Amino acid sequence: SSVLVLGRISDDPASHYEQLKPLLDYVVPRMREVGIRRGEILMAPDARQMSSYLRRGRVDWVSETTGAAMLLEQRGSAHPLLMTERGGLRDFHTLFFVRRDSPIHSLSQLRGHTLALQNASSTSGYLLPMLELLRNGIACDVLLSADDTPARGSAGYLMVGSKLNVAAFVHKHLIDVGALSNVDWDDERHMPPVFKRDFRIVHRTAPVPRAVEMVRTGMDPAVEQRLRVVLLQAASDPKAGPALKRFFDTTGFRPLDPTSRRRLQELSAGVQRVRDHV
């Protein structure tokens, strides 16, 4: 009530912490006029724990990619505050990549082969590629280990965790295909040029909005309204520049409109379909 709790779903609380605190310290002062005296960070390992936190009022505000955000909205636990823009981009998309020497030239040829995915909360590294497979009728069974092979006829996926692991498992001939975002592709820490030069892109998904600020359901409306106003004016405030750079390189927030509302409804439909089948 008197505390504002910011978080996100995170498999790396050590890095993500420092990405959240600066913006929080910018925001908290500017909320005094609606009750807020202080702030805390509270991350969670997955969507299900974050969702519990949200419903129990232990977290108030999260910044998420849009697939992950819909996982939270589906469980009744949060709703969108603003659309968020990162690295100058409103949208992003997933691409599937193989080694150049691979026989694979199209999504349809994932059949008989393995796919590296990230973790169940990743928009670009799990939700969107699984959705893509569903749309194309490509069965994709979970594989238990890198020794396990798919059915002849189906793809199979292996959860490798990190973005770097997706690149490194495929580079080293351990798994046939990898899924990463288009942003991830041009980012050298997750797609090292030494691996990239040995990869070829074989499929692209349709884009989705890049990210969204979500707030817990039950948030007091004047707190909600004011958090919205504080973030909206942050992009243009010099005093917020460093914090926004730290906050996953956020370069803009904007209100919701009929388009972004529709596109999240579509993406939520797809996410639910991924969840219905996995």
Largest sheet: 6 strands, mixed
**Residue share in β-strands:** 15-25%
Counting DSSP H or I runs of 4 or more residues, the number of helices is 10
> Strand pairing plus helix content: what structural class?
alpha/beta
Number of strands: 14
Pattern of helices and strands: EHEHEHEEEEHEEHEHHEEEHHEH
PDB class: metal binding protein
Keywords: Periplasmic binding protein Periplasmic sensor ATP Phosphonate-bd, metal binding protein
Assembly: monomeric
Entry title: XAC2383 from Xanthomonas citri bound to ATP
Question: How are the secondary structure elements laid out?
Answer:
Layout: E1 3-7, H1 13-27, E2 38-41, H2 47-55, E3 61-64, H3 66-74, E4 78-86, E5 91-92, E6 94-99, E7 114-117, H4 123-135, E8 140-142, E9 155-159, H5 163-171, E10 177-181, H6 182-185, H7 193-196, E11 199-204, E12 208-209, E13 211-216, H8 221-234, H9 241-246, E14 250-254, H10 258-277
Parallel strand pairs: 1-2, 1-3, 7-9, 7-10, 8-9
Antiparallel strand pairs: 3-13, 4-13, 4-14, 5-12, 6-10, 6-11
Helix pairs in contact: 3-10, 4-10
